[model samples]
Target: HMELALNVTESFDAWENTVTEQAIEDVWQLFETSIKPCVKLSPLCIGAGHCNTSIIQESCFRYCAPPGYALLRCNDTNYSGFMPKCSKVVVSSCTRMMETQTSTWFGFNGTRAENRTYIYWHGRDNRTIISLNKYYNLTMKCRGAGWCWFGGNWKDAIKEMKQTIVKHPRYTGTNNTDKINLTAPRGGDPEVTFMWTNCRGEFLYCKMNWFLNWVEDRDVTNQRPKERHRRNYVPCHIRQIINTWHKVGKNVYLPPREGDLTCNSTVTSLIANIDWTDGNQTNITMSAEVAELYRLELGDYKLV
Candidate 1:
């Protein structure tokens, strides 16, 4: 749904290289100005309600439930209370610390097939917490935290759940790692591989597969639109549908057919003119504009 690119240089003595330092600074600046803006607009930002960088502490809760439901206590330093009750047995996962200054609290009730709900919370410095009163079949309430308040018609809790699943730590961590690799696969070649031992002392090999391959095929040209003179003759819909089919079926779609040829031969070539990869070979560089666009769409923060 979105594209992100990063430029990284490996050096034995990175600190000793002034140019490397400058490049790093430039990338950081790009991240701040361009990437961060886009990330701020993502659903991740909306659900989390704030950037994780703004989080002073590192603690959060994650919940999992079977067909049934369960209740637990909030014994963390910031929150101490009894969890809501459920008719069915369910398992819950809670974090030790709040995710950020703008985290929200949520609760649910009802049977395995149906349920009522209550969700509310006050973000970091918020003076009042918000909540929904009527979810599936239950009325909910919140008290204790001075800023806590509860009242509102419950919207579908599934939306929040889906958002949480999409942005939650367990999901996002893996998703980002996958995206990073997808964007930069070749970056993980042996020359840059890093290995580390696990808690059991077994060595684990890790590589930075961040430099992805951009394959070009002359066949793409054959697939060009028949009505070439049309203003939007590119046939973006056809390309997208084909790509989607490839993705869903795990099939490798052939490159553009003969007539599909275009000035942009490869993704690498498209990004090559950017400042970051000006001097690098095979290392795709991401411009500030690209990075910013990616960040906004992906809802991630710049890691300085």
Candidate 2:
């Protein structure tokens, strides 16, 4: 494995590491590993109303791998739903799958009792079969620390996790193929690229402490200071506040606004029906600065 090749390269978060896509391929090459287990998909979980893994759902019965074989390739991929063509993925577990499941999948709650940190599992993704007890045991056994699986209110929990997340651009809109080149400062790395969206609809996707732990887990590193740079704010508003924030697959941070602040600033608005961008103009919100500027002649809000 020489390296893993990735399709992204930007972030709003200040933390740093340099794992490219080739970097991942290299690791895969170096380890030399596993095949997908021939487990039964008929368990109660398989898509009865749900758990019926992607195997039976798509009428892909003919494409299913044989009992001893593993899925090794895929083409024209769109993981918006599910895929076994991606079994090259499950078959190739470079390391302990769950042990490496660390990332911003969970978060700590507001305030704490004593010195122990109470972790909230943020379990909304049914794809993830974690239980409160399993989470509690892991935290206690692995770090000898406190943690929670089922926790704080949804909004608060999501909001807390949303704070530290930076993401890779996987969506068609933010992806590189756009003719307009909208992906300039987004979707550029693995710490960012795979922020875990499978269970996105189930819970608020936040960056977990062990979220990108595999980066450090799979490679050797030398002591060093940060190499990446970002805006000085906590980082919100997508392409708005700063035009260079990487994009995530979810919108817990949607309706993207810059921030709430006094505005001596100025802004502009579309005259009317000639609305320009891909979206409807009248529906857009402008900051007070821009709102005032647009409401009057440009000269009124100028240096005068």
Candidate 3:
């Protein structure tokens, strides 16, 4: 069963790799890889409810793991009304899947008391995965290593992993289409012409605006930190552009619409009328400083 599952997974990886590589090459002759950029990636953990593997009710585990092979805590409050089920098999299967996937790319680094780290896995999309941290620097096994074995420690691990992946140098690359001219032919709709360039640039800062709508009965006015509405509000990709000037460590100019909007008021109100995250005022800000810091530029920027 293990072999079969691994084979199936690897087959999918190979197929995806081929497709992505082709797409990248097609876009830019010098561009070598097809991986999607700036994707928030993480591991998906499969577990069962009302049992040992249950960490949070309804929500399965992601990249959170403790230092030791300690018994993960279960949220009894949420699982109280749910049906009881043992999760030994599911946990074991998921553990095996993680190990197999990591080992294939990263190899074994070192073994701790109860935990092991292999190559770092960064999920770009559900289908795209990348190895960012060096195979040797990736340390997964923990347990008995101070306070790194508890629930809060697991959360920290996820955060650290994301930071490390995002800051990794190997993930940086150049864009083929940098200069785009937005022009409209006479008596026609606007046409976008992408101009290819070889100049290396950096991506600095990014500001993403998310609009959410609430159902009639949902009262979210006073919700602190904002509550995510599932059915009524879904994330749709609208507009995203990286700011190059900010890469040089300069402050950026915020658009009038973005600067004048509020999370609860204008932003949410506009999206409530539209089904998609698209429309006029949906904004994304990126600067050169962010690009330089994250190494999202071709070549290297001088760190002063």
Candidate 4:
């Protein structure tokens, strides 16, 4: 008979690697070889009134494998709840039969525990099984570690994982398609495009926006000295936004390349959607200075 004597607090407390040396090495080997990027689902523990610890009322575990098999462990004489059950029916529902493999393993709690009987299953969708027996309480300790091998490149695996995680009801209004376009330039300038979303629940849906005002750090050796260039302070709001965006993705390097050098530095200022009162008409002034590194034929401007 399996041991159902674990205290309620002990059941919830984290399960550390406290088994024998051989068992510790074996578990590590299993984890090292198991499918990567495994996900952890919410534990399923349910019982009615006046339920005691001598038997298990109902305990279940859910694992995701996309279009692959799952590993389910349970031990009960009348084990009938081990099957595939998906939230969607069109592409995820399981209609075919499942294959079962019985195996006996030691308890995962500690070294003094005795051997336990359990069974594994390979079903079409994610797997979920419940144990309703008097001897075995199949509520396994969730180390947040399990395997579901979706054989493919790691990139494909991560993309598939992201989609699966974002669609869950717990993470509503979460942005999943956040990525940086590395190869293309934005606004015909050397800047990477950022695809971010404002996932506030107040809106009907998440709103994705494109921003491209970031540039790579200029090479200190290639730039003019600090004393030669005049620096100006930016508005507090603008400075905060720029600094926040810089921490997200890769930056584009704008080297000194020979290209179109048109004199298009005309400045314009416009403030809209506000009442123009006497104190509100504040003057915002800014200026720019250009120093020619190479003595070239600059039209209308001579280098002395």
Candidate 5:
């Protein structure tokens, strides 16, 4: 292992005051000088195909079934007229002047079995009447502002519903709410935009339990990889210095792990000595050389 040594006064300490900032400045400079010149970024999607019409479930697709139009079964491939113009990306912006608006609330109509279950399971009963009202009013406020009341993906929606239920004051882990009045006037039925399905082209009149269970399974399968890919560009010496400096503040009794210091009896200041040694047990004479080597090994990561 190689060692580093620096000399300074008792008041001018590296670890306690500003070692992190110092290390960051030094590492950045080293990176700029030794590595940044060679870095380059490439286009993400050069020839990637745009959206194509495909059956999501069975022989049925949402594009074929528009509001006020009969659900048309795709029998032939010649249906380009109905298809919207395909673009790599679509963006929209609008500005609206807001005058006084009425407070309209929207929630589950409780006509469907799924809606009934969702209302009862969430403990939106007499005890937690406020909770039910809040759900309705918030969704209505969202709709009144010309926004999707149930925003985000289906999975996110399911989880949000679950969290709301669990947080209810009357919610019990084992039992559903007893005083659920489906006929009770809560709010106006929400203007739903989603086409719920079980992936077989059939309408999702599915049970709440079944849908929630599916979401749980979907999340389990879709969870990110346990191990993350991290690119560390800092040289070992800089890293060691930063770590040792941080550790020094907490345990003053312990000596500096990577560096050394010698108190100058003649002078009022202390001489600090820090050394960095590689796996080959060779002292790194020039940090730039090692920094360049490390940069090359790590390669370049840039997005354009």
Candidate 6:
């Protein structure tokens, strides 16, 4: 669509010898005038509540239940917190950091032969043959500096946590790296911080999936429709020129594909004719114009 004109000469240095001052001037002027004024792009977080970049999930709701003070129940809400105690002790398993196991409750709570599976996990497990530790009554899902999460309403917990962490960003590093002192272990547990995600952005800390951090895909979260909204693109002419140039280089040929031995002369002539102040390659000038139009329609891309 667009175009190029490579100078092919004997020994390859013939083009080099022909790289003259006036030609160079013409090339620079062409780039500055035709290429520079195009497009530019970037991204910005609209933040939360500014306007919804995304919609909320169906079951999105928040309730606070502190480390020892959750006032709610699962699947069904019983804020009265008035469930009768059943007398069936369930066997427990040894737990470790990042370890999860299932438990089943049977024959309990007014119903016989009942079965319910429970998933329990330790938030920060650093257990080895020699060392072991566990934090209970906490939601360890959102990792901080190995510090545990106090279970409660998701929203309340996150808000409080973000405030706490974002306060002293100094000694409180933005990571969970454990600093150790062997010879002279003096200080307390080093304070660490996690980028506390709020509302829609909560996954930044609550979940540690690699896909959560890739920018390209992340943009789609709030991406607007291109033509209907702000958009950017390379000029069609520029794109056409580049494509034509590329096809010229890659337009392979063989006798079987054509009548004559010289299977492709059209592209060769086009390549030779690409220039600022052209002469005999008059046909190429028209090709260049078409390529420019193509670029205008398309673009390597520019920020709109």
The deviation in Å at residue 11 for candidate 1 is: 11
Ten contiguous residues with the weakest lDDT in model 3: 265-274
- CA error at residue 110 for candidate 3, angstroms: 7.0
List the candidates' TM-scores in order: 0.14, 0.18, 0.16, 0.16, 0.15, 0.12
lDDT of 1 by residue, 1-304 (tens): 1112233333334234543344333432322221112222211111122321222212235432111111222122322112323132223322111111111112222113223322222122211122222223223221221112223322334333223223322442242221111121221332231111111111111221221222322123445535333111111112211111101211121122223222211000011111122222222222222222222212222322
Q: TM-score of predicted model 5?
A: 0.15
For each candidate, what is the lDDT? 0.22, 0.21, 0.21, 0.20, 0.21, 0.19
Residue 301, candidate 2: how far off, in angstroms?
Answer: 51
Cα deviation at 57, candidate 5, in Å, is 67
Tens digit of per-residue lDDT, candidate 4, span 1-304: 1112211121211124222222323322222221334443222121222222221123335543222211222232322322323121111212111111101111112211122312211111221111111122222111111111112232332233223323332533464332211222212343332221111100011111221121122122434633344322111111112222213332121112213221111101100111112331211111101110000011111110
lDDT of 3 by residue, 245-279 (tens): 21211112112122322121000000001111222
Q: Give the per-residue lDDT digits (tens) of candidate 6, residues 41-87.
A: 22211113232121112221442211110011122221111232323
* Candidate 4: residue pairs that collide: none
Q: Write the per-residue lDDT of candidate 5 for residues 184-227, one digit (tens) a residue.
A: 11123432211111111111111112212231221234366355
Model 1: residues with Cα > 4 Å off, grouped in runs: 1-16, 26-214, 220-270, 273-284, 287-304
Cα lDDT of candidate 3 equals: 0.21
Total backbone collisions, model 3: 21
Between prediction 5 and prediction 6, which has the larger TM-score? 5
Candidate that beats the other on lDDT, 1 or 6, i.e. the better one: 1
List model 2 lDDT by residue over 227-276, tens digit each.
44422111111121221113332222112222332111011111111112
Task: Specify the highest-TM-score model's number.
Answer: 2
